[PDB]
Design a protein around this nucleic acid. Structure first.
Lengths: 54, 114, 88, 95, 52
RNA sequence: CGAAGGCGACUUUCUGGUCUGUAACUGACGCUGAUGUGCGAAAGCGUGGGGAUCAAACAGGAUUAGAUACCCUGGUAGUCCACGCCGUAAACGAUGAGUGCUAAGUGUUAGGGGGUUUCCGCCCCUUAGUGCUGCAGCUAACGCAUUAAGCACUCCGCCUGG
């Protein structure tokens, strides 16, 4: 699914205040778990948890 | 009026220049890369502020900066010893703020940090 | 699902064959809804762009199946094109 | 279906009354017509990760929607930064 | 953002190095400034999970 | 993934379509080919930007016993995006697109059946592919091959001197 903003409870190891994702082999995941890692976390991680750049 | 001054250092890979300024923008003076015989962007050497920036800082004597806080926006060889002119007369190098911006990002581009 | 919003809202008059899944005579004149409905399937955030040729060779699919019925029997596609509200 | 999951934070340089004037909407008005903020998903003092609102701590009240219709999320995506207890939003169609 | 004290400045050769690289999204930082080519990196751009 | 040129920031979209596990079902309802389908990258291409970067020109420098050139900031446009594209690339597969195999193997993205469930992992079946090799076949050889440069049923076009 598209895990929402507080839906990083067992995933804030992956979340960061300042920009750290774990890619595929970093968690040993396939192309659904890594994919939620890289897309579905972002609703919590990017919009008001990561200043990209100015 | 002591303990007030920042060596806000605009040092890239070259161009070891640093303003011996206040903690915020008022800009007293400097021994920068246009100050100790050089011009800048080939001064990848500390002698902007190897020795002769604390010449300026102690000719001022108003900072008394126990915290001189070189603030960088890039690399530089002479920048780690651009703070030797904050150790020469000994103004107690205490911080290294080597950061590029992360405010956020105006529009269909103007531009800002990478 | 089998898109019962339309695929089996139109069966109320177009379930001409039972086990109507698959019997192409069932999906007789369901092409009428996707004129602007698929333009809303796209235009919100746009590009279901080749859905134009999709819907139009779907009209072609009607040519493939309703004429297959015409060959099965002419009175079939007559009932579906003469007495039907989508005429000719 | 335009189901908008709206990451909104309050401008956290606020009092509970200024929170109240805007989060009294995000339980009932965001329950209008299948908008369904599922409950008071407006938690207390969180941590403002990327610093906005010139306030150094996060009072992360956020509107969460899992639906298909999602009526009244536009009613504070329009009130997003005009607000005194919302800052931003997320434009997300989710069928 | 970094304050390091208690170090010499002819020894600042070692103090100016160690707060740089640590970021898993070091790219998703950079976003909207200065964007480049993978040409010689097409040896290694069939790559993991970007969109395929 | 697209008709291709090609397709890249991400929250999202249509998830269109791939996609494999189910496929719930009337009775040839398709490939190529009159139709017709669209564009195809740039050099260049019909408006503000554009000389901001880069940048030809010019400057200006000079190797050792040789420039204005490798050298380029000011800088000529151009570069570039909000209104028009050509039908060209090593778009090369030098290898056209339907029915199916050629001992087959191979680890694997997807989606599944699962045992064991693990602590989300070990083992078996799996295919669009993914690669790897590798049987037959292949041509002179390059070298191709369960996914052709083979094998038996479809069309296309090419040309039998250039």
């Amino acid at each position: 699914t598209h895990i929402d903003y507080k839906d990083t409870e067992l995933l804030k190891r992956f979340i960061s205040e300042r920009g750290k994702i774990l890619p595929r082999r970093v968690t040993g995941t396939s192309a659904k778990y890594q994919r939620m890692l890289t897309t579905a976390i972002k609703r919590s991680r990017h919009m008001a948890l990561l200043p990209y750049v100015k | 009026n002591i303990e007030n001054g920042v060596a806000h250092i605009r040092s890239t890979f070259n161009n070891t220049i640093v303003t011996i300024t206040d903690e915020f923008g008022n800009a007293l003076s400097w021994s920068s890369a246009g100050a100790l015989g050089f011009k800048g962007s080939k001064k990848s050497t500390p002698f902007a502020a190897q020795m002769a920036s604390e010449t300026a800082s102690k000719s001022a004597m108003e900072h008394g900066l126990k915290t001189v806080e070189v603030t960088v926006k890039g690399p530089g060889p002479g920048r780690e010893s651009a703070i030797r002119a904050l150790q020469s007369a000994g103004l107690e190098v205490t911080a290294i703020r080597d950061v590029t911006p992360v405010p956020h990002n105006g529009c269909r581009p103007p531009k800002r940090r990478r | 699902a089998i898109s019962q919003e339309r695929k089996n809202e139109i069966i109320k008059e177009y379930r001409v064959h039972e086990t109507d899944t698959g019997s192409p005579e069932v999906q007789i004149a369901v092409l009428t809804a996707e004129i602007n409905a698929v333009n809303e399937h796209l235009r919100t955030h746009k590009k279901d762009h080749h859905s134009r040729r999709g819907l139009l060779k779907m009209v072609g699919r009607r040519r493939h199946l309703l004429n297959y019925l015409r060959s099965k029997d002419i009175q079939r596609y007559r009932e579906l094109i003469k007495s039907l509200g989508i005429r000719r | 279906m335009r189901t908008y999951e709206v990451m909104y934070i309050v401008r956290p340089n606020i009092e509970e009354d200024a929170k109240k004037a805007l989060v009294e909407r995000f339980n009932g008005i965001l329950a209008t017509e299948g908008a369904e903020v599922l409950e008071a998903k407006d938690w207390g003092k969180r941590r403002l990760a990327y610093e906005i609102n010139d306030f150094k701590d996060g009072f992360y009240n956020i509107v969460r929607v899992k639906s298909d219709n999602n009526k009244a999320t536009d009613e504070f995506q329009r009130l997003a930064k005009i607000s005194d207890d919302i800052i931003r939003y997320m434009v997300i169609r989710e069928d | 953002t970094v304050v390091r004290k208690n170090e010499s400045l002819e020894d600042a050769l070692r103090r100016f190095k160690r707060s740089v690289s640590k970021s898993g999204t070091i790219q998703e930082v950079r976003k909207r400034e200065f964007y480049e080519k993978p040409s010689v990196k097409r040896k290694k751009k069939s790559e993991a999970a970007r969109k395929r």
